[PDB]
């Protein structure tokens, strides 16, 4: 996250870190046993780290749970980036408590102008490699679909929407992918892609979680 701030500790109890060696992507806890992330975050083995704030220091609230199943959306296209969403089933249920808990799936997608909270352990610079130890947060508005498309002509599919700022300086970035965009108490987006990070006229592009509510619920049911 570029141009954000350090989140209050454990105030985003749904935020997870996906780890393979090191943190490589974020995710969101949606039930005791399931996490939503981005399909481009796929690896055949993932450790999910819940309850984190500082990912380099044991703080005593963490739960580390290996993924038992990792399921990319069947229509993910790695070249257009369409349908960039995935589900991870935890090998054991997370212990739900004040510091680890779920975020609701949405009942309607977010209107343009809605202010949302984007979070993750991604790069904090638009040029450079400053990967933070502590979880970062950004408040940012949903863009109209017209302005999203104008920013990335030809590239915005029906699975995608933009959140951020055309003036630059505030965005998600590498290592944020798969993490949450929360608006009005609902998981509305999955961090996906952008041209650069926080570049002028190049806002962040996110997967529209609302389009996948049925897929998520049916996939959870089919794999338990």
């Amino acid at each position: 996250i570029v141009g954000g701030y350090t989140c209050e500790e454990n105030s985003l109890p749904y935020q997870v870190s996906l780890n393979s060696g090191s943190h490589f992507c974020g995710g969101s806890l949606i039930s005791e046993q399931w996490v939503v992330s981005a399909a481009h975050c796929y690896k055949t083995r993932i450790q999910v780290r819940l309850g984190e704030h500082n990912i380099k220091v044991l703080e005593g609230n963490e739960q580390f749970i290996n993924a038992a199943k990792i399921i990319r959306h069947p229509k993910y296209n790695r070249d257009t980036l369409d349908n960039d969403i995935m589900l991870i089933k935890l090998s054991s249920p997370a212990v739900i408590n004040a510091r680890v808990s779920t975020i609701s799936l949405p009942t309607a997608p977010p209107a343009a102008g809605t202010e949302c909270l984007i979070s993750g352990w991604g790069n904090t610079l638009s040029f450079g490699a400053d990967y933070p130890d502590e979880l970062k947060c950004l408040d940012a508005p949903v863009l109209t679909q017209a302005e999203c498309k104008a920013s990335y002509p030809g590239k915005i599919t029906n699975s995608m929407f933009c959140v951020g700022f055309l003036e630059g300086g505030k965005d998600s970035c590498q290592r944020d992918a798969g993490g949450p965009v929360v608006c009005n108490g609902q998981l509305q987006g999955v961090v996906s892609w952008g041209h650069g990070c926080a570049w002028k006229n190049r806002p962040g592009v996110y997967t529209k979680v609302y389009n996948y509510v049925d897929w998520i619920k049916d996939t959870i049911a089919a794999n338990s």
Partner: protein
Amino acid sequence: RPDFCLEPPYTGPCRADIIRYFYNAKAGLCQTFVYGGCRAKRNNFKSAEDCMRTCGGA
């Protein structure tokens, strides 16, 4: 020693941090970079051994 070994590395638009290798023709060495997870260019290898096999060297 193919031409694409001389391309600059390309993180790409996706926002993961996948560890990959590129041949750095200035250093004469395969080196790591952050690959965002999609739309790779050719100077992008999963290990240093794969990078050295293809690019050396030169």
